[PDB]
Design an enzyme around this catalytic site. Structure first.
Site, PDB file in Angstrom:
ATOM      1  N   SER A   1     -46.420 -61.529  29.496  1.00 20.73           N
ATOM      2  CA  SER A   1     -45.840 -61.165  30.820  1.00 20.73           C
ATOM      3  C   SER A   1     -44.528 -61.908  31.071  1.00 20.73           C
ATOM      4  O   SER A   1     -44.387 -63.060  30.666  1.00 20.73           O
ATOM      5  CB  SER A   1     -46.822 -61.531  31.926  1.00 20.73           C
TER       6      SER A   1
HETATM    7  C1  LIG Z   1     -49.106 -60.798  32.536  1.00 20.28           C
HETATM    8  O1  LIG Z   1     -49.587 -61.916  32.322  1.00 20.28           O
HETATM    9  C2  LIG Z   1     -49.910 -59.764  33.245  1.00 20.28           C
HETATM   10  C3  LIG Z   1     -50.536 -60.370  34.492  1.00 20.28           C
HETATM   11  C4  LIG Z   1     -51.309 -59.256  35.177  1.00 20.28           C
HETATM   12  C5  LIG Z   1     -52.305 -59.832  36.155  1.00 20.28           C
HETATM   13  C6  LIG Z   1     -52.662 -58.792  37.200  1.00 20.28           C
HETATM   14  C7  LIG Z   1     -52.897 -59.443  38.557  1.00 20.28           C
HETATM   15  C8  LIG Z   1     -54.085 -60.395  38.514  1.00 20.28           C
HETATM   16  C9  LIG Z   1     -55.359 -59.599  38.725  1.00 20.28           C
HETATM   17  C10 LIG Z   1     -56.567 -60.510  38.662  1.00 20.28           C
HETATM   18  C11 LIG Z   1     -57.495 -60.085  39.782  1.00 20.28           C
HETATM   19  C12 LIG Z   1     -58.910 -60.549  39.505  1.00 20.28           C
HETATM   20  C13 LIG Z   1     -59.846 -59.530  40.118  1.00 20.28           C
HETATM   21  C14 LIG Z   1     -61.245 -60.102  40.195  1.00 20.28           C
END
Ligand SMILES: *C(=O)CCCCCCCCCCCCC
Lengths: 546, 163
Positions: A1
């Site tokens: 990311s």
């Molecule tokens: C790069 O590292 C991608 C990061 C994407 C993370 C999405 C947002 C976090 C979602 C976690 C929520 C947990 C739900 C229980």
């Protein structure tokens, strides 16, 4: 990311700006989905989320944009158990023999005959959590076992946390709302707002141990491999309690890295350390953030971001769409030199020709040099002391760099690496003057769409992960939901795409429409205002109730 | 009942859900998401319920590439009724309403679907969902940075024999 937040001191308009470039799977339970959510008067937020969650995970609102990146913090600890010498189902704490608990689960299994049978399975649990076995690494023998304490199992605040983020006004409100609840499981948060603040938070649920306990409670050989492992025979190695933590055993918010700046913050899955090198983040728990060499995606971003020149929306967009293979910057110049030094060596001819003709990108039209470069780098990574300038803690943005061609043994190894890499590429079914886009694709029904980008381990900001399937590389993860947000007077201007499209269903009108656009790198308006939404010639509207 | 949503879609099937409360908002979300991704959610709920082997047998894998049966064991352990119930009782009214709306909205789309955008219509595993299912999905995501990465390791943890 990747994430970059730009503040008033660097943006071309004197206001906040945010690039969100998360790298996540193209299928399954973490496949991003776009939506805009409005309860008029009190909630108006747009972005993307994970399947089954009725909140926005990465998005923007009227004065705020935020995003997340997987952090390098620990969210669990292993516990090495000392087993009772008379009973390997018992373990010792402060020298007292405690019994393991057994929890059985029963699973129905469809047999070959189409009929169901019941499988019973026992799950052994200690006071810390369940036992885990990694054969040849974390065994369960007659003297030791390992248990795992996951800090997020008691995080009942996760959904409320994102709902709260969805309601945040500006960067200071976001920080408040995230520090108060501590519901974020395993990501950093980066954000910018209209007034021009840029925020990084390493604010997640992280196991807490007071600083004087760490050296004595760590399992030294396992932490050196980056596993958060503790001594489970000692009650004093239980996670520390601090009444200021939102959850028992977790690190208080005051102790987690935060950077508030007006120039920029960035993260590419390295620690908090060099979020902005002008202001290093240091002195944190090793469970939280360590000072480790940054990956090439971070190095790449810092090379573009450091300095005094204003940053435009287009600057940040092109950091993704350039598809530049930043790892080439470190090795290709010396690699090409070695090629010139070995002219007329039959084994190296095609590789060196391809590499010298290569645009150094992972574009659709990028030459086979990228393929030769990848396979070489895979072998380069296994070589000892081949860097001309090894990692230097005083020059963390600029090291490692170059090939130590002056050391004769290295020169022998690097050349053999290149011969071996060439051979592997030449063995495979790559045609003549075939390009990267001919190889890397995403299948859509019976068709294929060429996908630009490449593995983030090669410093391609537009990270794309692929696996060999038949005659092609099939994309499985990487660039997914893209948003780039600025704040002109009228309202948030958001631009981007969902790389793999809204629907995973082949029957959908939205199975591949943004994928076609991702291929051509044609980012679109993310309509947010009623006006923007009404200007859309494809507008459909349905009202539903029960 | 007391469930109402207004949904606008712009280019590329992006939904814009307007409602007067969390319940209606959930309702719109789940309905829109079901239109695009009913089969995905159903599959992942099966996984998160530890029911992969029941529908697909032991020879398949989840979308996280775990063998069905070890995956089921892990999720059956993770998502035990008491864990779900404690998790639910800790949710705020707003979150509860979000989830209730979502389940209801997803199921409304399932009731009406004719295969226009759903390829798994008719499968025994495409079923009405409940709030517990969304808690199962949530908890599966929660542990993605912890015990989730050791699902195989947990299933394999068995005491030594006579060696
Ligand atoms: C790069 O590292 C991608 C990061 C994407 C993370 C999405 C947002 C976090 C979602 C976690 C929520 C947990 C739900 C229980």
């Amino acid at each position: 990311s990747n994430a970059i937040a730009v503040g008033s001191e660097r943006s071309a308009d004197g206001k906040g700006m945010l690039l969100a470039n998360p790298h996540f799977p193209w299928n399954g339970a973490m496949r991003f989905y776009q939506m805009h959510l409005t309860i008029p008067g009190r909630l108006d937020v747009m972005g993307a989320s994970l399947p089954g969650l009725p909140v926005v995970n990465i998005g923007f609102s009227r004065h705020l944009a935020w995003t997340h990146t997987v952090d390098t913090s620990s969210h669990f600890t292993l516990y090495r158990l000392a087993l009772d010498p008379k009973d390997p189902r018992r373990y010792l704490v402060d020298g007292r023999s405690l019994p393991l608990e057994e929890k059985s689960v029963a699973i129905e299994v469809r047999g070959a005959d189409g009929k169901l049978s019941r499988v019973e399975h026992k799950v052994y649990q200690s006071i810390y959590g369940p036992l885990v076995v990694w054969p040849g690494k974390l065994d369960w023998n007659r003297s030791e076992a390992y248990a795992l304490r996951d800090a997020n199992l008691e995080n009942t605040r996760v959904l409320q946390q994102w709902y709260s983020i969805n309601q945040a006004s500006d960067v200071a409100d976001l920080r408040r709302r995230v520090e108060a609840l501590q519901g974020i499981p395993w990501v950093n948060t980066l954000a910018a707002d209209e007034q021009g603040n840029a925020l990084y938070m390493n604010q997640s649920v992280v196991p807490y141990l007071k600083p004087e306990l760490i050296p004595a409670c760590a399992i030294p050989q396992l932490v050196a491999e980056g596993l958060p492992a503790l001594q489970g025979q000692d009650s004093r190695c239980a996670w520390s309690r601090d009444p200021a933590a939102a959850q028992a055993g977790i690190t208080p918010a005051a102790q987690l890295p935060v950077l508030l700046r007006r120039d920029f913050v960035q993260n590419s899955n390295d620690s908090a350390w060099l979020t902005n090198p002008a202001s290093p983040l240091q002195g944190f728990s090793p469970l939280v953030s360590q000072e480790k060499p940054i990956g090439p995606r971070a190095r790449y971003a810092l090379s573009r971001l450091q300095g005094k020149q204003p940053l435009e929306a287009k600057t940040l967009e092109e950091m993704v769409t350039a598809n530049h293979v930043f790892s080439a910057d470190q090795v290709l110049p010396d690699l090409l030199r070695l090629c010139r030094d070995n002219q007329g060596e039959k084994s190296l001819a095609r590789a060196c020709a391809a590499l010298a003709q290569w645009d150094r990108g992972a574009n659709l039209d990028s030459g086979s040099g990228f393929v030769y470069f990848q396979r070489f780098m895979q072998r380069f990574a296994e070589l000892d002391g081949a860097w001309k300038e090894p990692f230097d803690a005083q020059r963390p943005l600029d090291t490692p760099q170059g090939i130590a061609l002056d050391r004769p043994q290295v020169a022998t190894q690097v050349r053999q690496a290149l011969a071996d890499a060439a051979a592997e590429v030449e063995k495979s079914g790559i045609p003549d003057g075939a390009r990267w886009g001919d190889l890397q694709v995403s299948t859509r029904g019976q068709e294929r769409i060429a996908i630009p980008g490449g593995d983030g381990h090669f410093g391609v900001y537009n990270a794309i992960q692929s696996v060999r399937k038949g005659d092609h590389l099939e994309v499985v993860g990487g660039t997914s939901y893209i948003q780039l947000v600025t704040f002109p007077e009228e309202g948030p201007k958001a631009r981007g795409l969902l790389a793999f499209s809204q629907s995973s269903d082949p029957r959908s009108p939205h199975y591949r429409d943004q994928t076609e656009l991702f291929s051509r790198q044609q980012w679109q308006t993310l309509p947010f205002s009623d006006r923007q939404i009404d200007a859309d010639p494809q507008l459909q509207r349905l009202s539903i109730r029960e | 009942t007391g469930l109402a949503a207004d949904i606008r879609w712009t280019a590329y099937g992006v939904p814009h859900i307007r409602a007067k409360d969390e319940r209606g908002l959930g309702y719109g979300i789940g309905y829109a998401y079901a239109r695009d991704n009913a089969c995905l959610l159903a599959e992942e709920i099966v996984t998160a319920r530890g029911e992969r082997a029941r529908y697909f047998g032991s020879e398949g894998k989840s979308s996280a590439e775990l063998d069905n049966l070890p995956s089921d064991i892990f999720y059956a352990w993770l998502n035990q009724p008491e864990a779900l119930q404690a998790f639910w009782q800790a949710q705020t009214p707003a979150v509860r309403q979000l989830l209730e709306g979502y389940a209801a909205g997803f199921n409304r789309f399932l009731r009406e679907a004719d295969g226009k955008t759903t390829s798994c219509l008719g499968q025994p595993w495409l079923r009405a969902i409940a709030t517990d299912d969304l808690l199962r999905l949530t908890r599966r995501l929660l542990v993605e940075g912890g015990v989730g990465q050791f699902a195989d390791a947990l299933v394999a943890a068995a005491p030594p024999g006579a060696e």
